[PDB]
Symmetry: C3
Subunit: 281 residues, 3 copies
């Protein structure tokens, strides 16, 4: 199924009939960082499998819902169960839910992920406000926009220089200062590693030479689809480890260690993003 205007419209029609909510804000949350979705007020939970033209996700399994309701007095829509390109989903499958958000009325998309630290100033448990990216799949002919352009959503050749909104970054930092956890908050450039292997020690050393601050396996495809159709983005990485230190010390990362960092910061990240949603212009 192509992520075109007609197909996204049919999905938006089903959603509008079922939910009654007109959202201004969309959220996509990283693994272990989804507790806020369970606190949406007057919620409506819509399984992906029920929505016309949504991608099939039963090979991977696990949760896959769209959730609509209110947070802090604002109308939002959340994806519960993210689609990652390392699972084998196509460009069209990743893009359709973001384009449905656009047709529903979304103007701002908030995104969190888990990532590895490259910059020597980053420690496990730190947050990074993403200010730009290096898209290795995109340089190598696997950009999320490869294919026919869908003109109703955006231009054939987009400019990504303002993909990460500067005023949203400033508001996120302001709130961290108000609650005295600004010592945990950095800014940086995100490298997209297609995955699903954690980058090797020698790949990490290469990324340090190339000016990357953090590395991960998500987020950049959604950012590019959002920028293409005029949705503003704030993206925040939670740092699981420092891959450069680990390479010097011959220490390994694993998914168990990653999820333990998620649990350590989940409640603070929930409080942070609730206040960001409440304060958005």
């Amino acid at each position: 199924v192509v992520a075109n205007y007609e197909n996204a419209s049919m999905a938006a029609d089903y959603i509008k009939r079922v939910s009654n909510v007109l959202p201004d804000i969309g959220i996509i949350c990283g693994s272990g960082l989804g507790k806020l979705i369970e606190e949406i007020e007057e919620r409506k939970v819509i399984p992906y499998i029920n929505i016309p033209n949504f991608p099939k996700t039963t090979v991977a399994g696990h949760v896959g819902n769209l959730v609509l309701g209110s947070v802090g007095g604002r109308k939002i829509v959340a994806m519960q169960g993210r689609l990652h390109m390392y699972e084998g989903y196509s460009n069209q499958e990743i893009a359709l839910p973001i384009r449905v958000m656009k047709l529903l009325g979304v103007r701002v998309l908030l995104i969190t992920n888990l990532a590895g630290g490259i910059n020597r100033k980053l420690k496990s448990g730190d947050f990074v406000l993403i200010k730009g990216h290096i898209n290795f799949p995109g340089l190598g002919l696997n950009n999320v926009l490869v294919g026919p352009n869908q003109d109703e959503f955006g231009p054939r050749f987009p400019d990504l220089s303002n993909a990460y909104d500067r005023l949203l970054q400033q508001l996120a930092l302001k709130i961290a200062q108000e609650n005295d956890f600004q010592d945990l908050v950095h800014e940086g450039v995100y490298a997209f590693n297609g995955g699903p292997t954690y980058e090797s020690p020698d790949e990490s050393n290469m990324l340090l030479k190339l000016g990357c601050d953090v590395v991960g396996m998500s987020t950049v495809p959604e950012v590019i689809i959002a920028c293409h159709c005029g949705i503003k983005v704030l993206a925040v990485s939670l740092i699981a480890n420092n891959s450069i230190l680990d390479a010097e010390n011959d220490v390994s990362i694993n998914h168990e260690k990653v999820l333990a960092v998620a649990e350590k910061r989940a409640d603070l990240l929930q409080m942070w993003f609730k206040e960001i949603i409440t304060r958005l212009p």
Copy 2:
């Protein structure tokens, strides 16, 4: 449809019957840089859609013709409407028209494109004679030759060290000097960004560290198919902007600004390439 010997032969048969021209030279022109094709003498215009085994292009739309005739007393064949891999065309679709050129008798391929400047010596409106390339899709398993080898055209493992003919570069520079616009002409290494997003500010900074002089979204796939089957190549980039300066100053590029640079240099590029065609050994 595979770009094999039998399929390319059927297309060359149709063309020979219809056109009566036996070309020695092929040309592929960048966007806004196609005026020379409209001045081919005793022309024959052949829509792609009419030629057996040519790739289907109706999803993208816009012009798509093969044009044969004479320029400066030389027999040429031009592609009017380029195929780009960021549109979703396969390896086989890009390669077949070049292999048809080979069977028609082409020995030299002349190529122009629009590109972004990385080297700090490059300004908008400058020309770059391409002397080598960095093929990010090719390093990442999207090389145009991935697939079975077509032995009738070339070897399984080609060497690209002489892909950009040195004597053709010298002739192009000599002609610029004769007409006193050599101050506009540079040489450089071309990075292939699969596209269709313009490279991000942080991607541009990375390319500066890696020794790239210019970046664009075309040309390298055609160069590799030509080199594989023994066709000599001259490739010239027209510089739309300097991406490094733009990143320092937070200025954006867009397709409108690019086409305006094309119009500013179109007539000089037309005159230049007409003289190159006339003077080729």
Copy 3:
């Protein structure tokens, strides 16, 4: 055909019935480096085409057998006719033979290849013990594990930091010292170029800046599938040329020159790997 547990099991069943050998060790040999396979004792030769669910290889042609028997008193299984991703094989086709090795009982995989030298200390005819890698296809969304995870074999997010076993590297070096050819043996980081074009002169210069010691078109996909399912790996490159010197001197490489280096070192490499097999813990 997916490289899943059921499909790999059906192939392992056929093999066990036909061969009677229970192998502990697997080998994959580079081009021109396959003489050891012809000396396996009490051999059983099984054409790929006869084995349920093995990938179809008739478009490329040439040899394709699985060979089981004894070397130095140890039970082994060899692939005679390698599958390379630049031929157009999918992730699933490359992975299935390695996962069949796992089900047959393989605990150690020994791999050889031909490669280009980047590090200035490397000459034609040298050997490199691979200690880590830079996986350009993997950074760019063509990792061999992209797709659903096959949980019976390994985890969704593998760590590759110990993919190249350190004690196996030490044993290989010890044997070189015993036979007084240690002056030929180096260690280094391997860059995976998807292929099939030899890297360009400017790509080689880029790899020198990025800390790569050698470059080639194979091996990393098999290493990653082996690491994912807990098989230890030793990988050795035979150096065909130094690509950096060749770029400075405008000298070309070609497949004929590569195979001549293979023939010069084939008998010593055969003797080396026979002793490694005999001595494995």
